[PDB]
């Protein structure tokens, strides 16, 4: 099946340019859409037939398709223009989408996230229970991505995390929990949290001992 | 004035079937083809398929099929999209969207992508077969500034207030967002940083409430031995 390759987060400031890239085989042969989704609305049609603009959006928007890479630029980005933002293209009549793309208008600098991993209490491994919990706080921008280690082998399971949310000091945090059974916990030496944030990842480690 | 109005948000257990419908206005009803996107809280787009209201003709994405049945009224301007044996991955926000893309699949004869053009303003579906229940809070003990806080497991329904100390304790306090488990129950944590020489003297106790099932519990989040 069909997909489409989209960076999870671009950064700009205001006044700068924006590209968001979508990657896709032979891409270029086929139609592509951008929408845009605002945090607590509706997506939008920002650009169709891979550069055409709908009446009413700004021409500071524009669209290229070529080669495998498609690309929605914005030009002299505001900070109204901070939004999610999708691909889409078309498999046999079937609808795909990219991953979406965080855009952030930096509005301070940016910041290294802090990561506390918890190993389970006491009380929940007496409880015949076990939960990892990884919080990680103060970057920006509000874009992460989490990624669980059995000793050097990734965990997919049991994995849940929360999108980032901002803080009373205006930078985010997040956090990302591991259900296991106790059995789990003491079978292995050591369980890892990789957090990356803007391409270095920051990892704690804990143990059953 | 093109808009398309949805249905009220619902709540269903897993195994059953959940129905949304779709109201559309401001052009003729069966010119355009009308299609269904969902959203997982904090997940992207996932498209499930169109229909034609003229014709009736529906093409579903594959994950779909089998569990999807999309259906039209001309009379009323209104499509409808029931999705059966659902699970708890289904809980998402469910776009009601205008595609001006003429597909082969439901009766066009030349095959034309444009894109969605119109998306209603969502529809909230969330399936958990749980009822109201209190939360369970577990310590998250610490070891200069040291971090702590409680785990307010397995509650139902959202929302869960948490302070530190009955308010004593407001800096460096926060309270994350709540996850759905795949057992239909709510789970959040409330973190606070505080300087390591006050672990040996400062008693540190988050209060949660859980207000749908009057459940007040208090917890204190004691060090750990080791360093
Ligand atoms: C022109 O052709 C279309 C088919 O392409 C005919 O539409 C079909 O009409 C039948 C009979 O009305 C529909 O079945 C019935 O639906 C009603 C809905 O209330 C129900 O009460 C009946 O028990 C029966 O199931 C059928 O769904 C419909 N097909 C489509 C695709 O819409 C139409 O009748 C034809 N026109 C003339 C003048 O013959």
């Known amino acids: 099946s069909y997909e489409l390759i989209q960076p999870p987060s671009v950064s700009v400031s205001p006044g700068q340019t924006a590209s968001i890239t979508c990657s896709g085989d032979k891409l270029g042969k086929k139609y592509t859409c951008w929408y845009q989704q605002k945090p607590g609305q509706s997506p939008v049609l920002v650009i169709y037939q891979d550069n055409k603009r709908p009446s009413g959006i700004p021409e500071r928007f524009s669209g290229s398709n070529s080669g495998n890479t498609a690309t929605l630029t914005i030009s002299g980005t505001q900070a109204m223009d901070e939004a999610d933002y999708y691909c889409?293209?078309?498999?046999?009549?079937?609808?795909?989408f990219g991953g979406g793309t965080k855009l952030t208008v930096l509005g301070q600098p940016k910041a290294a996230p802090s990561v506390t991993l918890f190993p389970p209490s006491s009380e929940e491994l007496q409880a015949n229970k076990a939960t990892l919990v990884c919080l990680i706080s103060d970057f920006y921008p509000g874009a992460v991505t989490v990624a669980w280690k059995a000793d050097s082998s990734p965990v997919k399971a049991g994995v849940e995390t929360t999108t980032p949310s901002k803080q009373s000091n205006n930078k985010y945090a997040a956090s990302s929990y591991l259900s296991l059974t106790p059995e789990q916990w003491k079978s292995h030496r050591s369980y890892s949290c990789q957090v990356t944030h803007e391409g270095s990842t920051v990892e704690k480690t804990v143990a059953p001992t | 004035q093109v808009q398309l109005v949805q249905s009220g948000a619902e709540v269903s257990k897993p195994g059953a079937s959940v129905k949304v419908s779709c109201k559309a206005s401001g052009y003729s009803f069966t010119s355009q083809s009308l299609g269904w996107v969902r959203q997982a809280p904090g997940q992207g787009l996932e498209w499930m398929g169109i229909?034609?209201?003229?014709?009736?003709?529906?093409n579903y994405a594959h994950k779909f099929q089998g569990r999807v049945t999309m259906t039209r009224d001309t009379s009323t301007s209104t499509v409808y999209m029931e999705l059966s044996s659902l699970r708890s991955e289904d809980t998402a926000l469910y776009y009601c969207?205008?595609?001006?893309?003429?597909?082969?699949?439901?009766?066009?004869?030349?095959?034309?992508?444009?894109?969605?053009?119109?998306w209603g303003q969502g529809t909230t579906v969330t399936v958990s077969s749980a009822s109201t229940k209190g939360p369970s809070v577990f310590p998250l003990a610490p070891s200069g500034t040291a971090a702590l806080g409680c785990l307010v497991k397995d509650y139902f329904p959202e929302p869960v207030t948490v302070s530190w100390n009955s308010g004593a304790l407001t800096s460096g306090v926060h309270t994350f967002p709540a996850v759905l488990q795949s057992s239909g129950l709510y789970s959040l944590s409330s973190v606070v940083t505080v300087p390591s020489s006050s672990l040996g003297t400062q008693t540190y106790i988050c209060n949660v409430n859980h207000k749908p099932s009057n459940t007040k519990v208090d917890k204190r989040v004691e060090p750990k031995s080791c360093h």
């Open positions: 889409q293209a078309w498999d046999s009549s079937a609808v795909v």
């Open positions: 229909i034609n209201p003229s014709g009736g003709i529906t």
């Open positions: 969207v205008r595609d001006l893309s003429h597909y082969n699949e439901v009766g066009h004869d030349r095959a034309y992508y444009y894109g969605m053009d119109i």
